[PDB]
Amino acid sequence: MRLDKFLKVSRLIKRRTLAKEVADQGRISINGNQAKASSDVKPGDELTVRFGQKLVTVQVNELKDTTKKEEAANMYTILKEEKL
Amino acid sequence: MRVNITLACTECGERNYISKKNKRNNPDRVEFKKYCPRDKKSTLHRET
Amino acid sequence: MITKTSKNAARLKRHARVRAKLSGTAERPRLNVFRSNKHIYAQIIDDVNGVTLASASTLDKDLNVESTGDTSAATKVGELVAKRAAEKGISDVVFDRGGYLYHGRVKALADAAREAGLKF
Amino acid sequence: MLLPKRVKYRREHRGKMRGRAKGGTEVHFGEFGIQALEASWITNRQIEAARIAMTRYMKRGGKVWIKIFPSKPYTAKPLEVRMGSGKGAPEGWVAVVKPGKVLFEISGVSEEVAREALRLASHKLPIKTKFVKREEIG
Amino acid sequence: SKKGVGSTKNGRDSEAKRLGAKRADGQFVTGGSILYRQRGTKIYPGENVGRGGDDTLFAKIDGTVKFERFGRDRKKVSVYPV
Amino acid sequence: NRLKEKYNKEIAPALMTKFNYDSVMQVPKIEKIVINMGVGDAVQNAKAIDSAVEELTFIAGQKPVVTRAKKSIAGFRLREGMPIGAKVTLRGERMYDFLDKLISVSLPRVRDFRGVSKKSFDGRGNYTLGIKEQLIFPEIDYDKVTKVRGMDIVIVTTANTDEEARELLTQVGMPFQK
RNA sequence: GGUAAGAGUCUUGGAGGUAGAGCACUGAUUGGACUAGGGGCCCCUACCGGGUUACCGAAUUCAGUCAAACUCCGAAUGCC
RNA sequence: GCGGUCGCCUCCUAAAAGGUAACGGAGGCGCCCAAAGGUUCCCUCAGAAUGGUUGGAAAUCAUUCGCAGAGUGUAAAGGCACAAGGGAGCUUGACUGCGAGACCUACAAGUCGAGCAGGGACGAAAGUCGGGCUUAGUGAUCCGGUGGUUCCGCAUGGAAG
RNA sequence: UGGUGGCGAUAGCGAAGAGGUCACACCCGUUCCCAUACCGAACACGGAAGUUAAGCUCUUCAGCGCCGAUGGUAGUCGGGGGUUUCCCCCUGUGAGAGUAGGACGCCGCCAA
RNA sequence: GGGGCCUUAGCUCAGGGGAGAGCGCCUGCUCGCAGGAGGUCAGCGGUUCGAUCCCGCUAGGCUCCACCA
């Protein structure tokens, strides 16, 4: 699915507009290379989403489009977090 | 889940019978003894 | 309160379900056994004329038992039924067990009839 | 406005209207009534019109017994279409009325009030009508 | 101005199976032949008449077909030898 | 077996001297006592069915069996399977051996029960009494599962009228509300 | 070629539910008793209940209707 | 043109044998079940009321009134409590070669079938069993795949076929 | 009187009397053959203490249920005529409902 | 008028065993938290033990057609 859709369903960014703006500002990289707001993701990718002074790197496990927390916190797996 | 199966005789070896079974209810191999036309007797038949 | 049916009431339904399976009318008659609380009766009935070919019981002037249908001495009247069958030239019968489960002492009468000449 | 709120089938054959009335021939609830002389379908709108026409002129008096009920539906294909291509949608409800059948029943008023009310009902109906009363042999 | 409408959704039917009586009362019948075709036991088998797996009534011996009744609302087919 | 001799030696002439009979022998015997559980598992969650049925073995000496549903009901399904509740039908001289300890200790042990069924007859001679706890039976130990499990009893009298069944259960020794 | 079976009529015996009738089922129903339950209003409700309802009607019942996919019945003709 | 439909099964239309059309009116099927199959032995369903502690209109239990208002895998008709409807024991006949005689009728095809022989299952025996209460759950030929085969195999013996 | 069969609930439900010493039935116990998803309630065994109270047979009630005419009527084969989404005559067949009535059982075999 | 897709919190949308997000409103806690008000799942009626989930219809909102003389 799309990057902003994946960030919406994975609850990393709760709003799709904010995820779209973050990915359009050149902050999120998939498998090392920079990408736009619509890069297709696969289970087994290494996301490099950048918050405000954060370096959260997660791992994709599954892809399901459910807007409920019972079936949402099982797709991303945190690997390491870096403040700066 | 309902597939075509054949039943060969354990003694004669020929595939004498065909039937159907459900794989979910019967995962194991079935064992029905039937009449064997070559052996002139009722022998155990095994699914192959 | 409870007004449950008698043992003879379900026995008639059991007799009806038994007599549906075997006709008893192919020039080969049937051997009917009635087990009462005191002694046993035996009759041979064939359709369609309904005549009784042979009948015998413990309740008779002859054949002092004198058990009168408790022990395995019922085999005496069980073979005497076959005696009245053989004196009238009956070749073979079927066994009409009635509403009684075949485990005795109706089975004793059937075995006594089998040993005395009735080939059923 | 009379109609069944549930039916077994919404589309039925139109049927036939041969012979006299099978039942409802004799007046036995009210004192006076209308006896049908010809057979046609009676729409529930006509039944409502006849009932209001009787009830208004009988503002003081007894109640009206409606002996007929529009249980049979009729289907009406939409206009300007070709013939066939399926049966049309049901439009309304009619009652199959045979000659000799009693339609409406009145008791508890005078003779001329009942006659004028039945005349006002009969002028709304599409069938030939007559005035009948209860006979006591008996 | 032509306008279209649809559809029927009820335009299918199964093939009719030729049930009913196949022989008549008083007719000579050969053994094994079909007497009456059934869906369920509308008419019961009687003397020298069997019932098939499709509830088909057939004569068991050669004879003459007689239609009788059990009573009160039950029927029978019987074949009596000549 | 003491009550078996007791009723034949005391109540059997007492009924025939109470009012006239066509038959000298017609004393109404007892037929069946059934115990009904109806657990429901509160609700469908207690998977210890085999212990719930064996809880009834302390009350009635015969082995009880579970009962199965005949129609699913929308409140607490309970489909056609999963047998919930227990029914035991106990017969023999064990009616007499059960009613002896019943009218001995079971009725006065209840803290609030002083009289049951002044109007609760069926019209054809039924007595049915409700038990809420397990502490009523003295053979039930206090170190049990301790959850509230209730008993049910149904007394079947051979006499077909209320006026006969009431006058037998008054003089057999089982008290009434009055 | 078979040969005289074929057909009509009188007599007899059958199968099959149409016309008509009927509620004995399945629906839809109209009226009266009967009133499960719901509607306002007074004592009260911080809440249980009671009264009147010229108030609606799921049950059930005495009646009155209707039906191609309703039949306790049931023709005349046709059929064998 | 577009929309819809194309094969099979059930009811009505269908006119009291059978059959009978329309882009007529209603629904289902391209399965399921090693058991819901076979045999033997037992039993009778749904709802109303009374009484019951967690039960209130309904969970479970006793009673009456209950010829069926229940159930019959799946869906309509026909039928079934002398149960084909429910419960247990043992089993695989859910069989090999057949089959007198029949039903439908363009053909192809489809359906029932007494009874014989070989081997069984259940039952003391009589007897029943060649799938499910019946009627749908399925498609030709050609061409290939697999197993068997005292069949042929291009001069002979094999092999390819 | 008991067993066992054939006649379309004219064979049944409901009420009231009568029977038991023979027979049939309840009834009484589990040691045996056999048992229930459990249980001598059911199916088995052994006993004649207590009884017709129930089961069963006979005798009267037509309340419910059942069978059921004659006449009439509806319908209808065939022929004919109009005012032709229907109606009216003629020859012949002829319902359903209702009514009069019948009915609280007959016909066999064997044993006692 | 005829096909296809929906009618779900105040708004916008996911979704046979008993249904949810972001925004809008609150609740104590010093850029994010863990909880609550609000749902005839547009309505009726059938298949079973229950329907947002399967179906026959009524209103409504989008999309594609309504052509040849």
From Swiss-Prot, chain B:
This protein's record includes keyword Ribonucleoprotein: yes
Entry-linked InterPro entries: Ribosomal_bL33 (IPR001705), Ribosomal_bL33_CS (IPR018264), Ribosomal_bL33_sf (IPR038584), Ribosomal_zn-bd (IPR011332)
Compositional bias per record (Basic and acidic residues), positions renumbered to this chain: 25-48
Location of region: Disordered: 20-48
Gene Ontology BP annotations: translation
GO MF term list: structural constituent of ribosome
Gene Ontology terms: cellular component: cytoplasm; ribonucleoprotein complex; ribosome
Keywords annotated in UniProt: Ribonucleoprotein, Ribosomal protein
Family, per entry: Belongs to the bacterial ribosomal protein bL33 family.
Record text on subunit structure and interactions: Part of the 50S ribosomal subunit. Interacts with VmlR.
NCBIfam families: PRK00504.1, PRK00595.1, rpmG_bact
HAMAP family membership: Ribosomal_bL33
Protein name, entry field: Large ribosomal subunit protein bL33A
Provenance organism: Bacillus subtilis (strain 168)
Lineage, uppermost ranks: Bacteria, Bacillati, Bacillota, Bacilli, Bacillales
From Swiss-Prot, chain C:
Gene3D superfamilies: 3.30.420.100
Cellular component aspect of the GO annotation: cytosolic large ribosomal subunit
Superkingdom to which the source organism belongs: Bacteria
InterPro entries with a match to the protein in the record: Ribosomal_uL18_bac-type (IPR004389), Ribosomal_uL18_bac/euk (IPR005484)
UniProt keyword annotations, A-Z: Chaperone, Ribonucleoprotein, Ribosomal protein, RNA-binding, rRNA processing, rRNA-binding
Pfam families in UniProt: Ribosomal_L18p
GO biological process, one term: translation
Molecular function as annotated in GO: 5S rRNA binding; structural constituent of ribosome
UniProt KW Ribosomal protein keyword: yes
Subunit structure: Part of the 50S ribosomal subunit. Part of the 5S rRNA/L5/L18/L25 subcomplex. Contacts the 23S rRNA and 5S rRNA. Required for catalysis of RNase M5.
Function in brief: This is one of the proteins that bind and probably mediate the attachment of the 5S RNA into the large ribosomal subunit, where it forms part of the central protuberance. Required for correct processing of both the 5' and 3' ends of 5S rRNA precursor, which is does in conjunction with ribonuclease M5 (RNase M5, rnmV). Possibly folds the 5S rRNA precursor into the correct conformation, thus acting as a chaperone.
Family: Belongs to the universal ribosomal protein uL18 family.
UniProt name for this protein: Large ribosomal subunit protein uL18
Native organism taxonomy: Bacteria, Bacillati, Bacillota, Bacilli, Bacillales
Gene encoding the protein: rplR
Curated annotation (Swiss-Prot), chain E:
Domain of life: Bacteria
InterPro entries: Ribosomal_bL27, Ribosomal_bL27_CS
Keywords on record: Ribonucleoprotein, Ribosomal protein
Record note on modification: The N-terminus is cleaved by ribosomal processing cysteine protease Prp.
Pfam families reported in the protein's UniProt record: Ribosomal_L27
Gene Ontology CC terms: cytosolic large ribosomal subunit
Example GO biological process: translation
GO molecular function, one term: structural constituent of ribosome
Null mutant phenotype: No effect on sporulation at 37 degrees Celsius, however sporulation decreases at 47 degrees Celsius.
Family indicated by similarity: Belongs to the bacterial ribosomal protein bL27 family.
Biological role stated in the UniProt entry: Plays a role in sporulation at high temperatures.
Subunit structure, as described in the record: Part of the 50S ribosomal subunit.
Protein name: Large ribosomal subunit protein bL27
Organism of this sequence: Bacillus subtilis (strain 168)
UniProtKB/Swiss-Prot annotation, chain F:
Entries under InterPro entries matching the protein: Ribosomal_uL5, Ribosomal_uL5_bac-type, Ribosomal_uL5_C, Ribosomal_uL5_CS, Ribosomal_uL5_dom_sf, Ribosomal_uL5_N
Top-rank taxon, per record: Bacteria
One example of a Gene Ontology biological process annotation: translation
Keyword Transmembrane helix: no
GO cellular component: cytosolic large ribosomal subunit
Coiled-coil boundaries: none
Similarity field: Belongs to the universal ribosomal protein uL5 family.
PANTHER family reported in the protein's UniProt record: 60S RIBOSOMAL PROTEIN L11-RELATED (PTHR11994)
Complexes and interactors: Part of the 50S ribosomal subunit. Part of the 5S rRNA/L5/L18/L25 subcomplex. Contacts the 5S rRNA and the P site tRNA. Forms a bridge to the 30S subunit in the 70S ribosome. Interacts with VmlR. In stalled ribosomes contacts MutS2.
Protein name: Large ribosomal subunit protein uL5
Encoding gene, per UniProt annotation: rplE
